[PDB]
Design a protein around this nucleic acid. Structure first.
Ligand SMILES: [Zn+2]
Lengths: 142, 150, 129, 60, 97
RNA sequence: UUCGAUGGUAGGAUAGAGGCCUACCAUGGUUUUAACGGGUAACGGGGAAUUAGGGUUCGAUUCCGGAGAGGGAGCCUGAGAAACGGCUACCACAUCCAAGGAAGGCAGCAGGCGCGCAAAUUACCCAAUCCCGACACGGGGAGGUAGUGACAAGAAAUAACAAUGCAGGGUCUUGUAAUUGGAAUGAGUACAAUGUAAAUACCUUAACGAGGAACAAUUGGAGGGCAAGUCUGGUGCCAGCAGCCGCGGUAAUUCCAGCUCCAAUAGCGUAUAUUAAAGUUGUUGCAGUUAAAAAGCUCGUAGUUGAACU
RNA sequence: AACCAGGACUUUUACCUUGAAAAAAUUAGAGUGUUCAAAGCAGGCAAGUUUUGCUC
RNA sequence: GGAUAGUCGGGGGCAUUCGUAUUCAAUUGUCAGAGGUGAAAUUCUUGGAUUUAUUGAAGACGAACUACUGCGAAAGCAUUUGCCAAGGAUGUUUUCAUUAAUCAAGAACGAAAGUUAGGGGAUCGAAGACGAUCAGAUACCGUCGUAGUCUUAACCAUAAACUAUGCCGACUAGGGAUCGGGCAAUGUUUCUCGACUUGCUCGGCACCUUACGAGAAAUCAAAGUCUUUGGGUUCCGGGGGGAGUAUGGUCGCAAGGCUGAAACUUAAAGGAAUUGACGGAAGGGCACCACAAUGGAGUGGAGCCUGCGGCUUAAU
RNA sequence: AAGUUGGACAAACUUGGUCAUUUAGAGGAAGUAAAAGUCGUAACAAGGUUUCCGUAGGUGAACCUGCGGAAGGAUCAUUA
C-alpha cells in the first residue's frame, strides 16, 4: 500500500498532487473553467440583451412550453438562454429589454427537463421581478 | 526468499551450542593450522578445505579449535587470494556462460541467466568495494572477465 | 526481510490472545522487545516471560494472562513532544484511564504517563490495552 | 433544443381565472406578541386531542 | 462471478496446454478443458455372438473388442447428454456416477 | 556559455563587497531532491473563514516590507530621488491657438464620463494624535468631525393592566373578544442645560404627545428530505411547477385565488466563490477478484526501508 | 606524576527538554460594573468634615 | 551469497534417432457410382471413380501413456540419444559476514496474428470461387483454394498475456491425497540395491470440512491478523458517456505501440444476491378443447334459419 | 553660452522571424439533444452460428471469417 517511512513525505506529497487532478471539483477550480469556458467570468449576476423567445420542449416524462428567452450578454456578446420564473409574463418581457441574469443553483448544469438552460431573469428593464406579476410596480417607458 | 528465484528453501547448517573441541579431538590448535596452510598451498578453496577437515580429518568447526576462521588464518599467514571466494566463483560461472553464449547464439534463456549472474556479480563487487576488501578501482569488465577469473 | 522485530512480537502476542492461548513464543529477541515487555508486565498486562539464550538473537516465551484487548506498534516511530501525548492518547487509547502508550524517550523506554512525569518526550513505540 | 413552440398559448390559464374579492380582517399583533400568543395557546386550549394528531391546519 | 473454482478446467502450475479437437464438431478445445469419455465396444452385437459362433472357426475363439476415447467440447457434451447441467450444490461432486 | 554564462589575474566604476563593467586566461555553473520554460483569472506576511484532531480556502483591505505614479529612458538640486503635486527626450491620449506658438497626467481629498452585478459629500475643522518649518503663535483633503446608504457587529420597542356568555379546568384560572373604561406610556413636536473648534448624535430635560388607519412587520414553505392542508372556487399530462424524487389526462394536499399554520424576524429569499458534509484526495484516514483500478514477466539505479548484540 | 578542585569536553548529529533572542495589532486569556453587551484599558477611596491626597 | 554430495525436472540451445497419419507419383485387380449433407447441391467417374496391394517423395506433427502431475521469471515446454551451459529443493559441525526488500528512469525475454527477404510449402485455411437455405444470404453448410500455418536471418510489443487476485517478512485450524529430497523400519519383496508399505520433517502443485476472522454478497487459509484503523515498498482509480477520441511528443519501413485531454451532455451507469416472468435449455409428468387411430361424424362444397362487419336510409 | 568630435545610457521608428491569446475561413471528418420512418438479432435464453480478448482480411449497418488464447459457459464430474 502507501509508503510508511519516516522520510517518505516527498513520495506521499507527489502522489497526492498527481492524483488530486482526478477529482472534478479540483480540476474545475484549477483549470479556470468558471472564467474561460463559462458564459460569465465567475460573476454572480450579469446583464444581457434579449434576442428572441423559445418554447423549448420538455423531455420525458413531461412535455411543456417553458417560454424561455434567448439572450445576448452585454459584456461578451455571446448567446445563451434564460428562464422566466413568473407565469404568463412572456408578453411583459420583450426583446432588447436590457435584462439581468443570474445562476440557477447547479453551478452550470441544466435544470429539470429543459436542456440548455442555466440562467434566470432577476431584473428586467431595471424594474425587477415580483412586481410586474402582482402589478405593484409597472414597467418604465423606453 | 531466494535472491533470483521464486524458491523459499531454508536448508542450512545448525551450529552446536557448544564452542569447544570434542574430548578425544586433541587437535592441539597448531597441527590443524599447519594442515590448513598445506591445504591452501596447493590452492584449494577455503570452503573445500574446511569440508576436507570436517570429513576426512574429523576436525570440528575449525573456529572452535583454532580460534580463527579459515579465511582469517590464511590471510594472517599470507596465503590470501587476490579475490574473494564468492567473487571468484561468480566470475567463473559468468565467464563459462559467456563462452557458451558466444558459441550458441540462440539461447535466450542462457542470456537471461547471464544477465542475472551479471547483476549478482556487480552487487557483490559493489559491497566488497564499499567494505574495502578490494582496491577502490575494481570496475568489472565484460571483455576482460577472463582476466578477472584468471 | 524482517523490518521490525517489535511489530512481529506484538502481532504474535495479540494473535495468541485472540486465539485464547495462554502462552506465546516470540522470535527473535531484542532489548526493545524486553523493555516493552517489562513495561506491560509492570502495568500488569503480561505474566512472567523467559528469554531462551541460544547463540543467536534469542527467543522469548511469554505467559499470557488475558486482560489484553490489543497490543500494537506505531510505525514509523514519530517523534512525540509533551503536548503531542494528549493527541496520541485520544487517537489510540480507548479512554484517558485505560490503555498505555510506550515512548522511547531520552531517559529510556517507558509509558506515556511516566514520560509525562519525567517531563521528557521522545519517539512513539507502540500501545497496549 | 427543439424548434417548436406556440407563443400564443403561453399564459392561457392566467387570462381565464376569475378574480375574487377579499374579506377585511382586524389587525393581529405579530412578532413577539404572536410568539407569546401562540405560546399561551399551545398546550391548554386544544380540540385536536384523542389520538395525538395535533392538526394545526384542520381540514373538512 | 466465478462460477467454478477451477474456472471450467483443471490446470495448476501451468501456463499453456496443447489443445485438441472435438468429435461431433471438431472444435478447438484445451486438453484439460475437454471431456474425456471411454467407449469400450465389442466387434459384434450382443445377439450376433451366436451367429458368429455358428459361422466361425478356431474353436469358438474369443471375439476381440475396440477401445476408443472421445474428447467432447462443452457444447457438444451438453447436446449429446454425456454431460448435463447440474445444480449449484451438485456441481462440486466430481465423483463419477 | 555570442554581446558574461562558471572561476582566476589585473584594471576601471561605485559610498563600499562583487563578472557591475573592461582585457587576458581555463570551461566551467544548475538539474528527476524537477534545473529551464509556460500559465497565474499571483504584491508577500502578521492574519481571516470552516472548526474533535489532522486538514481546506482566502489575504485587493486599518499594521510591516516591496513596486508605481499612462509607458519606458536620462538627469540637476539635495545627506538621502532615477522624485514625476522636479525637469528633459520619444510613443499613445487629450488640450488653447492671431496657426508664430504654449504646453499636461486625481493608482492624493471631494466630484464627473465610461466599463460595469457591484461601492457615498465638488461638507466642516486643525480642538484631539502626530508631522514639517527660521518656529511657544504658521500650515497639514495626514488626521479628526459630520452627511447618504439596507446589512458588518452589539442592546431591545410593536405593549399590558380588567370586567366578558361559554370550551372548560377546577369556588381558582387561559382563550377569540365586530364592546368599553380607566392605567404604565415612547418615538416624535418644540424652547432649556450638557455635549462639540462650532455643530450632529448621547445622557439629563420647558411643556404637548396612541384607542384602532391606533403610530397595520414582513420574507419563504405546508408530499418527503425539512415544519406546516384529502380546507374551498378556476384550468385540466395544457397552462405549469419542479434544487432531487415527483405532481398536473375533472375529486389537483405540489398549478392560481381565499383562509389557517409553520421557520426567521427588521429581517427573509435568490445567485455565485469557499468550507464542513467528503473516510468521494484518505499522513491521521480510501479503494484495486467480480462495482473505477496489480503494469505480460524479469533485472536493477536514484528514492524509501533496513535481523540481534557493546 | 595522579590525588583533590576549577575553565573547555557532541568527532558529528537527528530526537526530546529547557533557556536566550525576537513588532504591534489578532487569538486564548488575567483584572476592572462602557447601566448588560459588542466595547475600552480604564480605574478605586469617601457618604458624618465633601476632604491642598493616597492606592492599584 | 558462494561452495560441496546424491539427486530431480514434458527448463534452454545444438546435433541426432524413430513413428504412423495426410497428400502426391508409378504400376497392378476390378467395375458403378464416388464425395458430401438433417436433405441436398457442386465436382469427378466404364477413358477405369471409390476401395485394395508394393515402392518412393514432401512437409507438418509427437496420439494412446497424459494425471485437479512436473519444469521454467512469464510467454511457454511431451519421440530416442549425445554434448554444452544452467536451475530449484534437500543433506551439510562447508565458506564470507549484512553483502538485503521494493522499484521512477533505465534494459533482457515476450503466444498467436501482422512485416521484410531466402528456403520450404503435405493438411488446414483469411480473401475468393461455386450449389441448396429463407422473402432476401451476402454468413453458417459441402468441395476447391490465395495470403497464412514450417524454418533461417532481421522487426514489433499485445491478448480473457487470468490465479480478472503486485513483491518481501511474521503469526493464525482439522483431515486425506500428491511431486522432489532427507531420516528411521531385527515391515514385505528383488536375480545390494531397487520396487511396495508405514511414521517424521523441509520445499511445491493442489483438494475436502469449518469459519475464530473478513466481505455488500458471491466467496476467501487469504481477499484473515483493519473504527481494536501504522512491518517495509512500487503500480494504479475518483459517476457513466464524450474517449483510449482529437491534438502534441516519441518507437517502428508499415499495420500500429507508449504517453494521453478539453468543450458538451446525462441522474444515473455498475457489483452481489432474492422473487416472479421468459428460454428455438434440461429433467419428471398431466390432457381427444393434444396426437397417434384402419379412426367415427362433420363444417368448410351447393342451397336456407340466425348473428357479426361492409352498403343504404331518416331510423334500419 | 550656443555649437562640435568621441564614449556609454539609451526612449522611440522602420524590416523580418519566433512565442501566448483572439478573431477569421468556404469546406471535410466526429460524437452528444434529437420530427415519423429505416432496421434483427450483433448482444441479453444453448438470443436461436456459446460468449469474449488480441491480430489480419472482407462487408451499407451492427458485423462474418482465418490463428492463438480466457470462461466472465451451457461442463468443476468417467478412476472402468
Ligand atoms: Zn464439439
Amino acid at each position: 500500500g502507501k509508503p510508511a517511512g519516516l522520510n517518505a513525505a516527498r513520495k506521499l506529497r507527489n502522489h497526492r498532487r498527481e492524483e488530486r487532478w482526478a477529482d472534478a471539483h479540483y480540476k474545475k477550480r484549477l483549470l479556470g473553467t468558471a472564467y474561460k469556458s463559462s458564459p460569465f467570468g465567475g460573476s454572480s449576476h450579469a446583464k444581457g440583451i434579449v434576442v428572441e423567445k423559445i418554447g423549448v420542449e420538455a423531455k420525458q416524462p413531461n412535455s411543456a412550453i417553458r417560454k424561455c428567452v434567448r439572450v445576448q450578454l452585454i459584456k461578451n456578446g455571446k448567446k445563451v438562454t434564460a428562464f422566466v420564473p413568473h407565469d404568463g409574463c412572456l408578453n411583459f418581457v420583450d426583446e432588447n429589454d436590457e435584462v439581468l441574469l443570474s445562476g440557477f443553483g447547479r453551478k452550470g448544469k441544466a435544470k429539470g427537463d429543459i436542456p440548455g438552460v442555466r440562467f434566470k431573469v432577476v431584473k428586467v428593464a431595471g424594474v425587477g421581478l415580483s412586481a410586474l406579476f402582482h402589478e405593484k410596480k409597472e414597467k418604465p417607458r423606453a | 526468499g531466494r535472491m533470483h528465484s521464486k524458491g523459499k528453501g531454508i536448508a542450512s547448517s545448525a551450529l552446536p551450542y557448544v564452542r569447544s573441541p570434542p574430548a578425544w579431538c586433541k587437535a592441539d590448535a597448531d597441527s590443524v593450522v599447519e594442515q590448513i596452510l598445506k591445504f591452501s598451498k596447493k590452492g584449494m578453496s577455503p570452503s573445500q578445505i574446511g569440508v576436507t577437515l570436517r570429513d576426512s580429518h574429523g576436525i570440528p568447526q575449525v573456529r572452535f579449535i583454532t580460534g580463527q576462521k579459515i579465511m582469517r588464518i590464511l590471510k594472517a599467514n599470507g596465503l590470501a587470494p587476490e579475490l574473494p571466494e564468492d567473487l571468484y566463483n561468480l566470475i567463473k560461472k559468468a565467464v563459462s556462460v559467456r563462452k557458451h553464449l558466444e558459441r550458441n547464439r540462440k539461447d535466450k534463456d542462457s542470456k537471461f541467466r547471464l544477465i542475472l549472474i551479471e547483476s549478482r556479480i556487480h552487487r557483490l563487487a559493489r559491497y566488497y568495494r564499499k567494505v574495502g576488501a578490494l582496491p577502490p578501482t575494481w570496475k568489472y569488465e565484460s571483455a576482460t572477465a577472463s582476466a578477472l577469473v584468471a | 526481510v524482517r523490518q521490525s522485530v517489535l511489530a512481529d512480537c506484538l502481532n504474535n502476542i495479540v494473535n495468541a490472545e485472540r486465539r485464547g492461548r495462554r502462552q506465546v513464543l516470540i522470535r527473535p529477541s531484542s532489548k526493545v522487545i524486553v523493555k516493552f515487555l517489562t513495561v506491560m508486565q509492570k502495568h500488569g498486562y503480561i505474566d512472567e516471560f523467559t528469554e531462551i539464550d541460544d547463540h543467536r538473537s534469542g527467543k522469548i516465551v511469554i505467559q499470557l494472562n488475558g486482560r489484553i484487548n490489543k497490543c500494537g506498534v506505531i510505525s514509523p516511530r514519530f517523534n512525540v513532544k509533551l503536548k503531542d501525548i494528549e493527541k496520541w492518547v485520544n487517537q489510540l487509547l480507548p479512554s484517558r484511564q485505560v490503555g498505555v502508550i510506550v515512548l522511547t524517550t531520552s531517559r529510556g523506554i517507558m509509558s506515556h504517563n511516566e514520560a509525562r512525569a519525567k517531563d521528557a518526550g521522545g519517539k512513539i513505540l507502540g500501545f497496549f490495552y | 433544443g427543439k424548434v417548436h413552440g406556440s407563443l400564443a398559448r403561453a399564459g392561457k390559464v392566467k387570462s381565464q381565472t376569475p378574480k375574487v374579492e377579499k374579506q377585511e380582517k382586524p389587525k393581529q399583533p405579530k412578532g413577539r406578541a404572536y410568539k407569546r400568543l401562540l405560546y399561551v395557546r399551545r398546550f391548554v386550549n386544544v380540540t385536536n386531542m384523542v389520538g395525538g394528531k395535533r392538526r394545526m391546519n384542520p381540514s373538512s | 462471478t466465478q462460477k467454478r473454482r477451477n474456472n471450467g478446467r483443471n490446470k495448476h502450475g501451468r501456463g499453456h496446454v496443447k489443445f485438441v479437437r472435438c468429435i461431433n464438431c471438431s472444435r478447438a478445445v484445451p486438453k484439460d478443458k475437454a471431456i474425456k469419455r471411454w467407449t469400450i465396444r465389442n466387434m459384434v452385437e450382443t445377439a450376433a455372438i451366436r451367429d458368429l459362433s455358428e459361422a466361425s472357426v478356431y474353436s469358438e475363439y474369443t471375439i476381440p473388442k475396440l477401445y476408443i476415447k472421445l474428447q467432447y467440447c462443452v457444447s457438444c457434451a451438453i447436446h449429446s447428454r454425456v454431460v448435463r447441467v447440474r445444480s449449484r450444490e451438485g456441481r462440486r461432486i466430481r465423483t463419477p456416477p
